[PDB]
Amino acid sequence: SNLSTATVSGASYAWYSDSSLTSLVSTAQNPMIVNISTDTTWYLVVTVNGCSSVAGSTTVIVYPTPATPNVPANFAVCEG
């Protein structure tokens, strides 16, 4: 999925993997998150002219797993 945030003049974008903001995942206004298997939250700190704001965030929600198909029981057929 592709996240999208505000473009701010003078800004530096820091994306983090956790609300603790100790480890980076990316640096972009529109980063891609890949191989998503669980709901995942990214946090964003925008620093403008040296001023770092409160991180914003959003959670990418993973669609439910589709149901297993209904097929017939083991069968047997006679040749021909």
Partner: peptide, 17 residues
């Protein structure tokens, strides 16, 4: 001025890029 961050675009398959 500062050490840059460098990011990969994911795992690469052997012989790829």
């Amino acid at each position: 001025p500062a050490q840059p961050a460098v990011f990969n675009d994911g795992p690469v398959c052997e012989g790829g890029n």
